[PDB]
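Ticket reopened. Same input as before:
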Amino acid sequence: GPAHLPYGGIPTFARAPLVQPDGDWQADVAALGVPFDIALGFRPGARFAPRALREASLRSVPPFTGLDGKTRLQGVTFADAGDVILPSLEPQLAHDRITEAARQVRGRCRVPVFLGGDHSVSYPLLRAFADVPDLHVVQLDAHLDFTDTRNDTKWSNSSPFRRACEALPNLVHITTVGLRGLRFDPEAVAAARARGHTIIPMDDVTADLAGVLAQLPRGQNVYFSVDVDGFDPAVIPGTSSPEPDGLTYAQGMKILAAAAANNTVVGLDLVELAPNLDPTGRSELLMARLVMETLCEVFDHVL
Amino acid sequence: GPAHLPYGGIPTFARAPLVQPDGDWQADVAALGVPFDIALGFRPGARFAPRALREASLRSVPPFTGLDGKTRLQGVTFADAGDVILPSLEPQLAHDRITEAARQVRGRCRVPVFLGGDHSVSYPLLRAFADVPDLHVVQLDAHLDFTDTRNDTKWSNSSPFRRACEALPNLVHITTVGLRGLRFDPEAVAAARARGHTIIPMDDVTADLAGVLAQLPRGQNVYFSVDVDGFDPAVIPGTSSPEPDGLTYAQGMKILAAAAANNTVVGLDLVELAPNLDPTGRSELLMARLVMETLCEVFDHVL
Amino acid sequence: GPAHLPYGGIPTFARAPLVQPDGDWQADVAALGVPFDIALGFRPGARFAPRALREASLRSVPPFTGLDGKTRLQGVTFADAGDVILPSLEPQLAHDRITEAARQVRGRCRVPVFLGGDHSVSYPLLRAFADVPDLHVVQLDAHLDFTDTRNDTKWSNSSPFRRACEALPNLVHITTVGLRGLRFDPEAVAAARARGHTIIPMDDVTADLAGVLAQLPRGQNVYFSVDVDGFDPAVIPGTSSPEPDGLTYAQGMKILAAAAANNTVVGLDLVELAPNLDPTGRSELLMARLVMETLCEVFDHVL
Amino acid sequence: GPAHLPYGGIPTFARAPLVQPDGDWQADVAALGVPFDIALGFRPGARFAPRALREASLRSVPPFTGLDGKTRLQGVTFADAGDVILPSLEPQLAHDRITEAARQVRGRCRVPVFLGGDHSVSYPLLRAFADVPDLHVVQLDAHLDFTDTRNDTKWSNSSPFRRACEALPNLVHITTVGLRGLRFDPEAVAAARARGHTIIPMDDVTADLAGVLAQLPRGQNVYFSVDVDGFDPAVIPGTSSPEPDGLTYAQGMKILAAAAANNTVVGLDLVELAPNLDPTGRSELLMARLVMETLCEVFDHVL
Amino acid sequence: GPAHLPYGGIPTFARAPLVQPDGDWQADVAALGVPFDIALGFRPGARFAPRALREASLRSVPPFTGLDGKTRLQGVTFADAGDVILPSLEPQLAHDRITEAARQVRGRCRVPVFLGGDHSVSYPLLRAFADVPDLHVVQLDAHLDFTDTRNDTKWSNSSPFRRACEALPNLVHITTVGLRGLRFDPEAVAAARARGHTIIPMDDVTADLAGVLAQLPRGQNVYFSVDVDGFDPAVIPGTSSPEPDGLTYAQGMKILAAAAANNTVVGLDLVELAPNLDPTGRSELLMARLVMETLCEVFDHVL
Amino acid sequence: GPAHLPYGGIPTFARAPLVQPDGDWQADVAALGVPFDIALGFRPGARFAPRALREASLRSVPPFTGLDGKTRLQGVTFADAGDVILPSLEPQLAHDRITEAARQVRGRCRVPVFLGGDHSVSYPLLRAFADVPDLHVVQLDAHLDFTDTRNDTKWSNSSPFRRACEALPNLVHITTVGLRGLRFDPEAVAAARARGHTIIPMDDVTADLAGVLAQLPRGQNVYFSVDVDGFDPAVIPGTSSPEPDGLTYAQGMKILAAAAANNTVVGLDLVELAPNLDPTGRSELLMARLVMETLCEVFDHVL
Ligand SMILES: NCCCCCCN
Ligand SMILES: NCCCCCCN
Ligand SMILES: NCCCCCCN
Ligand SMILES: NCCCCCCN
Ligand SMILES: NCCCCCCN
Ligand SMILES: NCCCCCCN
Ligand SMILES: [Mn+2]
Ligand SMILES: [Mn+2]
Ligand SMILES: [Mn+2]
Ligand SMILES: [Mn+2]
Ligand SMILES: [Mn+2]
Ligand SMILES: [Mn+2]
Ligand SMILES: [Mn+2]
Ligand SMILES: [Mn+2]
Ligand SMILES: [Mn+2]
Ligand SMILES: [Mn+2]
Ligand SMILES: [Mn+2]
Ligand SMILES: [Mn+2]
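Engineering reply: fixed in the latest deploy. New output:
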C-alpha cells in the first residue's frame, strides 16, 4: 500500500505503533520521551525535543538498504511508548515517574531509546538499570556532568552522572568524549578520576580519532548517553549551551558504531536537543538519524 | 491519574485514539488530515497544518467546563483517523484518495473534521457528501473560490467550490462570509450569483453583525468550510494570502455558533493554515481552539 | 549633554542607576526582576522577559512631555535593583529569595515594579506585602490563577493567588479582569467567588467598559498584577498561553489608569512576557511602555 | 498568454517595465525606491523595504476588478525607475541624488510613488516639488517629525518636514494624522502649530473619524507621506518604532481615499517599513496593497 | 560612475540586463529561473530560490579581480531571461513550458544558467539539450535521483535523471558526487550502474579528492547539475532534505573547477535551495557565489 | 553567596562593574562598546552586537579553571565603561566621540576591549593609540579593509585601516589573516603591500598554519582587530558579508594565542557581529568566548 511522506501521518518514533509503558507488548526497540527541561541553567526548549525527534524520525523509517546493497535493521520491530507523564516542578516526583516508566519499557524491549529532555533525565533513567552488572556509560558531551551541587541544587543537568553513581554501585565506569570549554568543575573532575572514569577531551578526537576508539570499553554492558552539544555547534546549533570545535556527525557516529560493535548495548538516551534554537531544523533531523544509525550498528553485530 | 501537559504525549487531534479511516470503529467526532498544499498559488506550508493543529489541539482537549461552571462535549467521543495517504504531485489521484477516506470516516462518525491543506481539498472532501439533500455550505473566507480556471488548471485552491458544484447537484447553496480585497474573478462572481449563492462582504459584518447572522441558512444540512484567511491577518497571520481588515476570532465564531444552532451540521474543514508563516504560534493555537469551540456549539444543539 | 539612543548603553529599567536590593539607597520607583519560568505549563521563555523589558524600556525613559505639552514623572526618581538571584529548580528556595529581595526593595522605594517571570512569582512577591491593611489586587489576565493544585504541584503559575491568600490574611480581595477561554478550574472560580473576589470576563469589558471601571476598587491599597496574556494575542503575541479576543493596549491602560486614580498603589508586577515568542519585538516594546505609562498615572494621582 | 504567479518573475513594482530615472519614457504612475535607513534612531531594516514592497506588489498587479464588477486603474500605465544610487554614509550627497532622481521621475509621470527608506527621505523627496503652488502634505504617522535637531543631527528621520518647510516656501500646510505615544518634542509641536499645520491625534480618529475627514484639505495640491508606523503594530509590526493603538488598515485607507477624491495628488511616499521585523510578511503585503488601493482612488477621481 | 550597494536596484542575476527568453539579445551567459517546488517530498520553499539567488548575486557582480590581481569574466556578457511562466499544478504543462524556455535561452547564449526549483526541473531542462553529442552530466548531490517511481509518480525530484535518460539517448553518462545517507533505492542504483554511470560517495571525496577529480570526464560536453544538499548542512542548511557530512564549499568548487577546465560546459542548474529554511541567509549568498565562481572557471578555459 | 545564571542580572561585559570612561576607576581589563553600523555596505545589525556580546559574556565570567585544574585570569580585574554616546549620522562627530572615549578607557586599564559595531569603528579606535611606538595590528578578516574610497565615502567599513595608517604614522605594520573571496580592491592591495603589510590568505592557514604563526610579530606592541567574518560562516553566520571556507574557531584562536604569547597586547576590538542574522545565538556566544579566551592567553604571558 502507499506510504506517507514525512509530513503525513501521526508522528511516532520511526512510525512505530503506539503503546503504553506497562502494556502487553514486546519489541526489539522501544522509544520513551522525557520532555523535561527545567533543570538546565541557560536556554530552555529541550522539553520540545521528543516531539521534534519523532517528527524528524519520519525521514528515517527502517529498515535501511545502503549504497552497497546491504540492509540493516531488517527484522527489527519498533514501538513508541509515548512520554513519561511529568508533573509541573516537583523534580523528585518527576524522577520517580521517569525511573518507573523506564523500568517498564526496558522490561518489554531489547534496546530502549530515551528522548530527552535536558541531561538531568539521565539520572532517573539510569536508576532503571540497577540490575546490569558492571554497567558502563559512554557519554558524548562537551561537559562532564559529574558535579555535586550547582546553583543550590543536587538535580541540575550538571549532576546526572554524579547522582547516578552514588545511587548505583553497579555503575562502575564512565567514558566521556568531547569535553571542551574554558571552565570545568575541579571537584567533579577530581571525583570522576578518583573513580577511574575515562575523560577524553575533544582535542584527543581531533588529533587522533583512532586513539579515541582505542580507549573505548570492550566486552562490557554499555549505556549510551548522547548530549547533542558534544557535536560542533555549526553542525547541531539547536542546544542550550554550545561550545565551539566539537564532534562532526561522522566522528560522533564513528565513536558510537565502534562501541556498539565491541560491547553489549543496553540502552541509549539523546538529550539537550533544543528545536526552538535551530530554525533550519537540521539539528533534529541529524540527531534523529543519529539514533537510527546507532541502532543499525547495534543490531548489525549483536551477540 | 496524572495528565500530560501540552508538550507531552503523541499529538493526535484532541488526544483522541488513532484509528484507520476504514477500521472497525465508531465515534461522535472524527478528525482526518489532508496535508496537501501544492494547489495554492503563493506561499506553501499548509501541508504542515494538520500536524500543527493536532499539536495545538492538546491545549483544547475535551470536554470543557466554562467560566459559568457548565460543561460542554461531555460524553462526546473522538477519534483521529490519521491523514489521507497522499502521493507526490498526481492531483487527480490525491483527490480520489481524499474522497475515499472522507467517505469512510463519514460513515463511522456523527461529525467529521477535516484538516487541510490548501482550500483545493474542499472539493474532494465535498464529493463525500453527494448524498446529502439540499446541502448548504457556510464558508468563512476572504476569497470566493468559485473560479473556473486559474493559471491553466481546474484544480487550484481558487476553484474548489466551482468544482464541487458541477460534480454535486445536491449542493444547492453556498453562503460565503468575509470577502474582501482589490481583485475578484468577475466570471466567478457572476457564476456564483447566478446559482443563487449568498455573498457576504466583510464590510457588511463590520457594519452590522446581527444582520449577517440573519442571512445564514436555517433548518438546512450544513457543511462548514473555514479558510483561516477569512480572519484578520493581525489575529491569524499564518496563511498564504492575507487580506487586511478581516474577522476577529469572536466574529467568525459567532457566525459558526449561529449556524450550528439553527442547522444540522454534517461536517467541517479548516484550511489554509500555514504554521511556518507565524513564528509566534498563535495562528495554530487559535484555529485549533476554533475547531473545538465549533464542536461545542454543534453538540449543544443535537437534534 | 548627548544621550544614548535605544541601542546604546547598559540596559537598566528606564535607564535608572543600578543598586543592590539591601543597599543604602532610596527612590520613588525601583525595579526588581525575577527571571523564573519553570512553573508554567506550556511554552518557556519568560525567564528572558526581565532583560527584554529593560532593553525595551530604553524607548520609554522618563520624564514624559506629552502632545499637550504637559510633563509627567518630572522629578520622580528611579532605581534598578537588578534581579533576584535564583537557584536552579528548588522552587521553595527561589520563593524565599524572591520574598526577601522584594521586602528590601519595598522598604527603599514608594512604588516597586516587579518584572517576571511566569505568574507563579506573584506569590512570593505578595508575601512581601504582609503589613498592608486590606490589601486588594487588581489583576489583568485571561486566566484566574486561583487553583489549589495543578499537575501535582502547589506552585504552578495557575496557583499564585491561591497561595498568596492562604499566606496573607490581609489580602482581602482580588479583582480579575480579562478572563476568557473554553476552560476554567470550577473549584478555583467558585472558591474565588465564595471569598468575595470580583471576576470580570473580557466579554463585560467589550460590552460595557464604563461598567467595568465602576467595579474597580476605590480608596484601597492596591497591588497591580499584569499578566500580558490578558491583552489580545494580536497585540501581544509573546506569551506562553494566548487566548483570542483580549484587551487592546488602550483598554488595559484605561483599567490601570482608573484604578491608579482612586487608590493607593503599593506595587506592580508584569508577568508572562515571552520575548522569544515574538520576533517582531512589539510585545516587549509595548509592555515596557505600559509599565511606564502606568507609573505616569500612579504619580499623577498620588496622595 | 499565461501570467506569472506572485513567486515568479523579476520583482518590479506592480510588475511594471523597468526604466531609468533620466531615460526616455512616460507613464501615468512611476515608482522610485530610496533604500536609505541610516537616519533612523532605533531598529534598521527599512533599506530593504523598496525590494520587499516590489515583491509584495506582485500580489497587487493592476488593473483591479472588484466584487461589484467595476474596474479601476484600467488603462493606467506604470513604470519602475528602480532605485536612487545611494552612497555609503554621506547624507548630504544622498539627499542631492534623491532630489535629482525625484525631479527626473516626476517630470516623466503624473503620479510618482516613492518607496523608502526611513522617513528622512521625505525631505530630499519634497525638494523635487518646489514648483507646486500651495503644496499640502497629508501625513499618516504616529510621530510628528517636525524636530529641528535630534541626537546632534539635522537630518534624522525626526526632522524631514522641518527641513522641507525651511527649504520650500511653497509647502504651505501639513496635516498629520495618527499621532500617539508618551513623548513629543515640545519645540517641534509649537513650531508646527505656529505655521498653522494641523495635528490630528489618533484619539480623534477613534472618537470621530468624520470630524477627522472634515479637516482634510479640499481642492489642493496634495503630497501623501505614509509612515507605516501610523498603523497599529498588530496590523503592521514591521517597523522600527511601533506605538500601540494605531490606525487599522481600513481607517488609514479611508483617510487616504477621502483626500485622494478631493484633491490633486502630486505624489506619495511609503516609509519606515522594516520587512526584517515581520517574519509573517504581512507588513509588506498589506503596505504594497495600500499603495495600489490609494492609486485606485486617485485615478478614480481625476478632474 | 556610482554603483548600487547589494540592497539597491532591481534584483536580476549578476545585476545583468533583463530580457525575454525569446527576445532580440545575445550574451555569453544567460540566467533562467524555474520556481517549481511541488515535486519534492518534504519541505517546500525552493520556488523562492530563483529570486533569493538573484538578490544574493548582487554581492557577486562580475568581473572579478582576485588577490593576485588577475581578472576573470572580463568582457563576458550576462543576461537574465526572467523565469519560466509556470501554471499551478499541471506538471506536464510545466515541463513543456520549461523545455521551451530552456531551448530559447540556449540559442541566445553560450552558457545558460538555470535556477531551480526542486531537482525535478533538471528533466525538462535537459530535454533542451537533445542535440548535444555524447552528453555527460556532472551531478553534485547527496542523493542519486535515478528512481523510477516514488509515491505514485514518475515526476518527483527523485527521478529527474531517470526521466532524462529514457528521453535522451544522447545522454550517455552521469557522474554523481557526494552521495551519502542511510537509504538508497537499490533499483535506481542498479539501473544507474547498468548504464555505466559513475557513483562517487562522499566518503571517496573525503578519502582521496585527487582520485575523485581523476574520475571526472575529460574532453566531453558537460552539463553541471548542482543540488545544494550535496554540500554539508552546516555550510548550506537552506535545503529540504539535508544529510550530514557533505561537501565543503571548497570541495564542491574544486570538483566544478576541474571539470570546467577539461570539458566543454554547455549548461548548469542550481537546485533545491530553500531560502526560507535558512534565516541567516548564508545558503543563498554562498550558492550565488558558487554559480559565479563556476562561471569564472568555465570561461578561463573556453575553446 | 549564590551567583546569577546567564539569564540573570544586568548584562555588563564579564558581569564586571559599570563605570564611566572618565570616572575614577582602575582595572586590568575594561570594555567599551561602539554601537555604530551605518558604515557597512550590506546587512545592518552590528549596532546591537555590543549588547549581544555583553549578554553572551555572562556564560564566560572570569576567572576560569580549565580541565587541567589550572586557573587563568585569577585576580585579573574587569570593568565595563558602557558605550560611546553616538549621534545619529554625523560620522565625523561619532569618530571624535569614539577616539576620546577610547583614550580615557585606555588610561584607566591595562587592556581595553572594544565591542563593535561595523569595522569602520577601528579607525577612530586606533587613533587612541597615537602614542604607541611602532604599533602593529594583527587583523583576522575575510577582507583587507585598506580601501581608499568606496561608494563615494572615506569612512566605510572597507577603509578603517587605510584611514588609521594615514592618521597614524606610528602604525608601522599590519598582518591580516583569513583573506578570501572573489573580489579584492587592487588599489587597496597595492597600497598595503607598498607599506610592507603582510597579507595572509585563508588558503595559507589551511595549507600550513605553523607557517602562518611564524609570520606573526614578536616583542611588539600589538592591537588585535577581530572581524567575525574572518571565521567560517558555518561557525559564525551572524555577520553582514559572509565568505565560505573561513577560520574555524580553533584556528582563529590559535592565531590570537600565538601573538599574545610573545607580544605586548595593547588592545583588541571585535567587530561586524550581527546577532539579528543568527537566530541560533551561537555567533555571539562563541565570539564572547573568543574575547575572554584571548584575555586568558594575554594575561598568561605578561612581562
Ligand atoms: N558539568 C557541568 C556542566 C554540565 C552542563 C550539562 C549539560 N549541558
Ligand atoms: N477565488 C479566487 C482566489 C481564491 C484563493 C483561495 C484561497 N486562498
Ligand atoms: N487559572 C488556571 C490557568 C492559569 C495559567 C496562568 C497563567 N498563564
Ligand atoms: N517627531 C520625532 C520622532 C519621529 C520619528 C520618526 C519616524 N519614526
Ligand atoms: N534518489 C532518491 C532521492 C532523491 C531526492 C532528490 C533530491 N533531494
Ligand atoms: N576591503 C574591502 C571590503 C571590506 C569590507 C569590510 C568588512 N566587512
Ligand atoms: Mn550533558
Ligand atoms: Mn553538554
Ligand atoms: Mn482564502
Ligand atoms: Mn479559500
Ligand atoms: Mn496569569
Ligand atoms: Mn494568563
Ligand atoms: Mn513614525
Ligand atoms: Mn515618520
Ligand atoms: Mn539531493
Ligand atoms: Mn537532487
Ligand atoms: Mn570582513
Ligand atoms: Mn573587516
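Residues A 119, 143-145, 147, 157-158, 185, 188, 227, 229, 241, 272 surround hexane-1,6-diamine (ligand 1) (CB under 6 Å). The domain at 1-303 of chain F is CATH 3.40.800.10 (Arginase; Chain A). Please confirm and we'll close it.
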